[PDB]
RNA sequence: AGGCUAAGGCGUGUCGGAGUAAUUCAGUUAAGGGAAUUCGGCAAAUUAGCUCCGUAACUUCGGGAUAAGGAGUGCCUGCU
RNA sequence: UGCUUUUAGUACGAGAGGAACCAAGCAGCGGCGCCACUGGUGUACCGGUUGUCUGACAAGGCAUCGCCGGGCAGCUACGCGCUCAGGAAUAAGAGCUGAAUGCAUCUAAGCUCGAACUCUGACCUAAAAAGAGACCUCUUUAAGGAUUCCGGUAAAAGACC
């Protein structure tokens, strides 16, 4: 089913519960950066992204990773040769659930003149990739950009068992839209 | 049953044979013949198939000493000499006593039973010699005298036999006269040497010949006969008749102590923990069954077998496998392979009991200053620590424009070359701000550059790296986000020095179980509430979230701690890293959604607030000090002491050991400039000085504004004091 | 199998969820049945130190979970007597994944193993860091 | 014949009797009796328990 | 409330008894395992007061809620 | 009644694969007994402590043994000891001799082997075995038995020792 969870949600709302819920059904939580801490403190066991994509991470808070044949795993069809291939490789994981929202962009005019520098240097680059990747998976992998629908997902999983096409679809569409 | 294999078994027998061990060493002045003696000793007793050594400098098992002709640092080898029909394991402590060494000297000396003072037959007792001898003796390491290079006198300077022994006598004299001024109590316990007592040999390492009063008689070979062979090209005969290893190993065993005995007085002098304690009695009177004592003194990182830490098995049998600890860094690592040292290589053996330097792999808690133990919180021979960071930086430039590339790579290597600096390798200006640990260290490295690589470059005025510090407890300052939808009422106050120290110690971490960390802090001083409400530690700064029941703060956290770390990296005043600063968050008005809580809004507010607070709490600077140790003559103390006093020399000890006024003080790093020169200049060239990071200290308020202004200028800042007023804007 | 020197009470019966203490990716395995054990009416399958059980991986990696595997118990809290009259007990129960022959699927075993299993299956002993 | 000392009371384990207790970290403790085992498992320390040799040593330290 | 005591009311409704076996009504405790028992966790066990922190999906916006999940708690000395 | 070692990587087989007699240990279940060891219980006993009463201390009552910790004896298992056979006569079956039926034939007589079966044999019970037993000792107003007394290796009453 859905047994891995890469949740690097910029906005740290709902992740607490979501993560517990997951941990309960199983679903190894492979988050990093902010999320990691918050969860490994609330109690939810979380594994750091470090041991998945070949090389670790950097400047937590936005950057993190950006690995080709790891985003290509989740991407689309994690069970169809060519595509799936990028979710296995060398310890490379076949993560099936992703939720990474993007803190909205802002300019925040500083008292001493517009903080253009910082502004530009806080445009999430990592996020949009992971997101659009997972999103791409109208099939297999499920992406949940929006934080305000953790319920629906959890609900379905808990009850039904596996996620539903209908849902996967909406989720993806929404995620792409969000990156837009 | 190869000769080597039979020796190997012998090796093991001797290992579990502490009474038949001799952990000896070699102590001498530069270019006296250390490496020479060493390697030719190895080959002298033929422990290995001769050829093996020589060409591949064995004793020099590392890579630096391997091109010198005189020993430089530590490691060890082994000899097994047959004396009156009896073999004895002779560990050969490599000597890290070259003047270019401080703590290392001590470290090895605290693993050397005794040594061999090697005095050039011509140049005689030398400054270096004096230093090493006195040191070693201080740490209770009985030596013997092997006047090497007699060959020179005999031939080169065509001296006659009678004169030969007149000169050597005068040396013997000098030797003891010093020993006397070093420790009269030990000179009363008869450690002093004399060739008639077999504790002094005579020979030439480079020619492998060597004699000594006893052997002399035994064989019939007299000083005059020696002179005859030397003058008549019979040094080959000499060598054969009276081997070098022969005489040396005789001194090394017949008059030099074994683990057991050595350990006794050694523990009594060096160690300070109550000898009634088990560990104590264990390592005093030969016992390896007790608490593990394995002070790693070397890390032979075998490229094809991992980190192989080499320490003397003062206590602690080495049965295959053992989860243990260490001194200071007493964490929870194990102990896998424990090879002993045969020849210069690592012969893998099982259980090693007492006085037998062993190399252990799979040891995370194992470096210099760490005495690997199986009894947590092990008492200290000589207190040690582990922290050391760049405090004195210089702006290495490249005058010669046709050198930049070379420079770039040379300092790109300098990193591991000497892991004590942190060059800010840049392209914007080309000025590589090399951050060293000490003005002298800097000077040394810089010199090494245009010497071993020879880049036609220099270095500009060294500058001290300060820390920014607050003075009092502040009043809640509101940090407002641009959009005003977030307000962060926060205050700060000085960080408790105790907590400071322990955080720099590393034990207190943010990766620590609540209970664990909390407790430590709680007793250290941190009021329970705060200890329970901490959420981050940066160098010597903490952000104690002391608020309760604030919606969305749980998540929010990150952005605020970001601002926190930013401001802490460069304080609002002197733009220096903050240190000894603890913040307490008191209120967190937040907007409901995250739209109006995006990092671009949070980060500013926090930053703004913290900075404003710091400035309102009389921001000062911390100046590092640098514990001085001046190994100088007794007599010499007038100008010396007055000098340090004029340089704020807090004397913490003066050790006026007989004819030596070894003053131990503490002087501010910034004021250490020039001291190098003046000390010796005034003391007629008689001042072996050495220093070490004396800890940051609240800069004397005296001329704080002055120091501040200087920094401001140098780092090109504004002349209006960065008034908190503005930071805490509308 | 080869006889052990000690007398081992079969302490763990079917349904027990035991911590798995090797690096195979199985954290908790539930005992399903005991190999080479014939029971009697109403008696649950019983296993002590040195016994091989069929287990189901309840926690751990997704590859380990839901798999029917073979495991060997290496630690048990129920006290067992050595031939010389001394009674030995561990602080917890612990098992390691193996094959039919007794070879461990893992490479290192965290924690002490019993000398009985260390001798009955020599490869478990070599894989284990310390044998008590 | 291995001569063993009770970890709690410090008494010699008589042959054919007594227990060996092993913790997860490989630490081994000889117990002469169920009393000593129970007191060890309660978290009580021998140095604070007066009837044991470690308690007696702690008291005679004064 | 429950427990221990006043006042007041009572010992008022078959005895004795040597292991007083087995069995049975009602209880206490129980190694290791922990629902494998059973139609079914029936029965039993767990938790439990008060203070503080923290509290999800969903919602008819009232709630869910003591949700969940954490920390403290005795005595003595001196006090605000 | 199984597993493992050995036989044996042998016979067999081109290989792959792969036995049997004998021997040893262990294990599962069953049976019988036992309590040195280990575990449980242990309302004998010892301690800590909550609430309350006896004026306080001390010493005591009550609250499930108030609760909590420990525990000797005893009992107990989750602990411990012991628990092959051999022989006879047979079933299926394999043979010997052997005619009817010159030969042949395990069969019609006769004969030898042949099972976890049956019997015997190492266990328990058994003079109320109506054929109601054998032997020895003691003594015939005795031997000896019971009752009373102090008990427990025994015991529901009896009985038993």
Strand order of the largest sheet of chain B: 12-11-13-10-9-14
The helix tally of chain B amounts to 24
Question: What portion of residues of chain C belong to β-strands?
Answer: 25-35%
Helix content of chain C: under 10%
Shape of chain C: globular
Radius of gyration of chain C: 14 Å
Overall 3D form of chain B: elongated
**What oligomeric state best describes the polypeptide chains here?**
part of a larger assembly
Can you walk through the features of this model?
- The structure is cut from a larger assembly and holds chains A (180 residues), B (730 residues), C (132 residues) and D (62 residues).
- By secondary structure, chain A is mostly helical.
- Helices cover 40% and strands 5% of the residues of chain A.
- Chain A has a four-stranded parallel β-sheet with strand order 2-1-3-4, with helices on both faces.
- The two termini of chain A are 29 Å apart.
- Chain B is built from 24 helices and 28 strands.
- In chain B, the strands form six sheets. A six-stranded antiparallel β-sheet of chain B has the order 12-11-13-10-9-14, with helices on one face.
- In chain B, strand 3 (76-82) and strand 4 (87-93) form a beta hairpin.
- Chain B is elongated, with a radius of gyration of 30 Å.
- Chain D has 62 residues and is of the alpha+beta class.
- Chain D has helices at 34-41, 53-60; strands spanning 4-5, 12-13, 19-22, 28-31.
- Chain D has a two-stranded antiparallel sheet. A two-stranded antiparallel ribbon of chain D has the order 3-4.
- Chains in contact: A-B, A-C, C-D.
- Chain C binds two RNA strands through residues 1-4, 7, 9-18, 31, 36-40, 42-46, 48, 76-81, 85-87, 89, 93.
- It is classed as ribosome.
Brief overview:
This is part of a larger assembly, with chains A (about 180 residues), B (about 725 residues), C (about 130 residues) and D (about 60 residues). Chain A is mainly α and about 180 residues long.
Topology:
The structure is cut from a larger assembly and holds chains A (180 residues), B (730 residues), C (132 residues) and D (62 residues).
Chain A: E1 4-6, H1 15-25, E2 28-29, H2 33-42, H3 68-75, H4 81-84, E3 97-98, H5 116-120, H6 126-135, E4 142-143, H7 150-158, H8 165-179
Parallel strand pairs in A: 1-2, 1-3, 3-4
Helix pairs in contact in A: 1-2, 1-7, 3-6, 6-8
Chain B: H1 3-15, E1 24-25, E2 27-28, H2 34-44, E3 76-82, E4 87-93, H3 103-109, E5 115-118, H4 127-138, E6 143-147, H5 150-154, H6 161-182, H7 184-188, E7 200-204, E8 209-212, H8 213-219, H9 223-231, H10 235-241, H11 244-255, H12 259-269, H13 278-284, E9 294-302, E10 306-311, E11 338-342, E12 345-347, E13 358-361, E14 371-372, E15 392-396, H14 404-417, E16 432-436, H15 439-452, E17 463-464, E18 467-469, E19 477-480, E20 487-494, H16 497-505, H17 514-524, H18 528-532, E21 537-538, E22 541-545, H19 553-569, E23 581-589, H20 599-616, E24 620-631, H21 638-646, E25 650-653, E26 663-668, H22 675-682, E27 688-690, E28 693-698, H23 704-714, H24 724-727
Parallel strand pairs in B: 1-4, 2-5, 5-6, 6-7, 22-23
Antiparallel strand pairs in B: 3-4, 7-8, 9-10, 9-14, 10-13, 11-12, 11-13, 15-16, 15-17, 18-24, 19-20, 20-23, 21-22, 24-26, 24-27, 24-28, 25-26
Helix pairs in contact in B: 2-11, 6-9, 19-20, 21-22
Chain D: E1 4-5, E2 12-13, E3 19-22, E4 28-31, H1 34-41, H2 53-60
Antiparallel strand pairs in D: 1-2, 3-4
Chain C binds two RNA strands through residues 1-4, 7, 9-18, 31, 36-40, 42-46, 48, 76-81, 85-87, 89, 93.
InterPro entries (chain C): Ribosomal_uL14 (IPR000218), Ribosomal_uL14_arc (IPR019971), Ribosomal_uL14_CS (IPR019972), Ribosomal_uL14_sf (IPR036853)
GO cellular component, one term (chain C): cytosolic large ribosomal subunit
Keywords (chain C): Ribonucleoprotein, Ribosomal protein, RNA-binding, rRNA-binding
């Amino acid at each position: 089913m859905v047994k891995r969870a890469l949740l690097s949600v910029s906005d740290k709302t709902g992740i607490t519960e979501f993560a517990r819920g997951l941990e309960a059904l199983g679903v190894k939580i492979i988050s990093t950066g902010g999320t990691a801490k918050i969860l490994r403190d609330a109690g939810i066991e979380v594994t750091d992204v470090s041991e998945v994509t070949g090389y670790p991470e950097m400047m937590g808070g936005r950057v993190k990773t950006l690995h080709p044949r790891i985003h290509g795993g989740l991407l689309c069809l994690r069970e169809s040769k060519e595509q799936m291939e990028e979710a296995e490789k060398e310890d490379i994981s076949l993560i099936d659930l992703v939720a990474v929202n993007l803190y909205p962009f802002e300019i925040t005019i500083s008292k001493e003149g517009v903080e253009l520098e910082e502004a530009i240097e806080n445009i999430d680059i990592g996020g949009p990739t992971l997101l659009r990747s997972a999103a791409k998976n109208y099939r297999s992998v499920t992406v949940i950009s929006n934080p305000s629908d953790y319920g629906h997902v959890l609900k379905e999983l808990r009850s039904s068992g596996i996620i539903s096409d209908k849902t996967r679809a909406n989720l993806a569409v929404k995620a792409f839209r969000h990156t837009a | 049953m190869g000769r080597r294999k039979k020796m190997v078994e012998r090796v093991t027998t001797l290992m579990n044979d502490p009474q038949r061990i001799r952990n000896i060493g070699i102590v001498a002045h530069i270019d006296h013949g250390k490496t020479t003696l060493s390697d030719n000793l190895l080959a002298g007793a033929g422990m290995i198939s001769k050829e093996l050594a020589g060409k591949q400098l064995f004793m020099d098992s590392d890579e630096e000493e391997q091109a010198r002709g005189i020993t430089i640092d530590s490691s060890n080898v082994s000899m097994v000499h047959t004396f009156d029909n009896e073999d004895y394991l002779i560990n050969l402590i490599d000597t890290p006593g070259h003047v270019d060494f401080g703590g290392d000297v001590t470290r090895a000396m605290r693993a050397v039973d005794g040594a061999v003072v090697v005095v050039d037959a011509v140049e005689g007792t030398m400054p270096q010699t004096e230093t090493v001898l006195r040191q070693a003796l201080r740490e209770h390491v009985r030596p013997v005298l092997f006047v090497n290079k007699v060959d020179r006198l005999i031939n080169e300077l065509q001296v006659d036999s009678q004169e030969m022994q007149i000169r050597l006598g005068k040396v013997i004299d000098h030797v003891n006269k010093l020993i006397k001024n070093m420790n009269p109590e030990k000179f009363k316990a008869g450690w002093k040497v004399d060739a008639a007592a077999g504790t002094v040999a005579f020979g030439s390492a480079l020619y492998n010949w060597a004699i000594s009063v006893p052997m002399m008689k035994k064989t019939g070979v007299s000083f005059k006969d020696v002179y005859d062979y030397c003058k008549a090209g019979d040094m080959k005969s000499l060598a054969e008749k009276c081997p070098l290893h022969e005489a040396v190993l005789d001194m090394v065993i017949h008059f030099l102590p074994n683990p057991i005995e050595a350990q006794k007085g050694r523990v009594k002098v060096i160690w300070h923990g109550d000898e009634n304690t088990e560990i104590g009695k264990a390592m005093t009177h030969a016992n390896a069954e007790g608490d593990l004592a394995f002070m790693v003194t070397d890390i032979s990182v075998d490229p094809h077998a991992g980190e192989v830490a080499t320490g003397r098995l003062f206590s602690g049998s080495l049965t295959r496998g053992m989860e243990v600890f260490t001194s200071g860094s007493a964490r929870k690592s194990r102990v896998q392979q424990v090879g002993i040292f045969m020849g210069p290589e690592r012969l893998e053996v099982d259980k090693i009991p007492a006085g037998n330097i062993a190399a252990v792999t799979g040891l995370k808690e194992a470096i210099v200053g760490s005495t690997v133990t199986t009894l947590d919180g092990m008492t200290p021979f000589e207190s040690i620590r582990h922290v050391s960071e760049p405090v004195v930086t210089v702006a290495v430039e490249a005058k010669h424009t046709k050198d930049l590339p070379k420079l770039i790579e040379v300092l790109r290597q300098v990193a591991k070359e000497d892991p004590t600096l942190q060059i800010t390798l840049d392209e914007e200006t080309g000025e590589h701000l090399m951050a060293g640990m000490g003005e002298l260290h800097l000077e040394v490295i810089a010199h090494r550059i245009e010497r071993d690589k020879n880049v036609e470059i220099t270095t500009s005025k060294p500058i001290v790296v300060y820390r920014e510090t607050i003075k009092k407890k502040t009043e809640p300052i509101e940090g407002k986000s641009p959009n005003r939808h977030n307000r962060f009422y926060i205050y700060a106050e000085p960080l408790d020095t105790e907590i400071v120290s322990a955080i720099k110690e590393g034990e207190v971490s943010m990766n620590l179980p609540e209970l664990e960390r909390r407790q430590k802090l709680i007793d250290l001083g941190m009021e329970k509430e705060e200890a329970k409400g901490i959420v981050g530690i940066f160098n010597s700064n903490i952000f104690i979230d002391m608020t309760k029941g604030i919606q969305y703060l749980n998540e929010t956290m990150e952005l605020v701690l970001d601002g926190f770390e930013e401001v802490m990296r460069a304080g609002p005043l002197t733009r220096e890293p903050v240190a000894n600063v603890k913040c307490v968050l008191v209120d967190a008005k937040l907007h409901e959604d995250a739209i109006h809580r995006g990092p671009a809004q949070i980060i500013p507010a926090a930053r703004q607030a913290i900075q404003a607070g710091m400035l309102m709490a009389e921001d000062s600077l911390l100046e590092p000090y640098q514990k001085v140790f001046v190994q100088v003559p007794q007599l010499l103390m007038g100008g010396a002491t007055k000098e340090l006093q004029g340089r704020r020399g807090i004397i913490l000890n003066m050790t006026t050991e007989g004819d030596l006024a070894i003053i131990e003080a503490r002087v501010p790093v910034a004021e250490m400039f020039g001291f190098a020169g003046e000390i010796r200049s005034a003391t007629e060239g008689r001042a072996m000085w050495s220093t070490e990071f004396g800890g940051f200290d609240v800069v004397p308020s005296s001329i704080l504004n002055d120091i501040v202004g200087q920094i401001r200028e140098r780092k090109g800042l504004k002349k209006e004091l960065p008034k908190a007023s503005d930071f805490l804007s509308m | 199998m080869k006889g052990m020197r000690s007398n081992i009470p079969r302490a763990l019966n079917a349904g027990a969820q035991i911590a798995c203490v090797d690096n195979t990716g199985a954290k908790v395995v539930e005992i399903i049945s005991v190999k080479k054990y014939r029971g009697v009416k109403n008696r649950m399958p019983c296993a002590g130190i040195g016994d091989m059980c069929v287990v189901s991986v309840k926690k751990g990696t997704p590859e380990m979970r839901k798999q029917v595997l073979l495991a060997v118990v290496v630690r048990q809290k129920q006290e067992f007597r050595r031939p010389d009259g001394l009674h030995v007990s561990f602080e917890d129960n612990a098992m390691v994944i193996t094959d039919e022959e007794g070879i461990p699927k893992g490479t290192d075993i965290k924690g002490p193993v019993a000398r009985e299993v260390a001798e009955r299956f020599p490869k478990i002993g070599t894989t284990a860091s310390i044998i008590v | 014949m291995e001569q063993r000392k009770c970890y709690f009371c410090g008494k010699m384990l008589e042959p054919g009797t007594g227990k060996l207790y092993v913790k997860k970290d490989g630490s081994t403790y000889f117990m002469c009796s169920s009393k000593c085992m129970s007191n060890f498992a309660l978290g009580r320390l021998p140095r604070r328990t007066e009837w044991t040799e470690k308690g007696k040593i702690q008291l005679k330290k004064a």
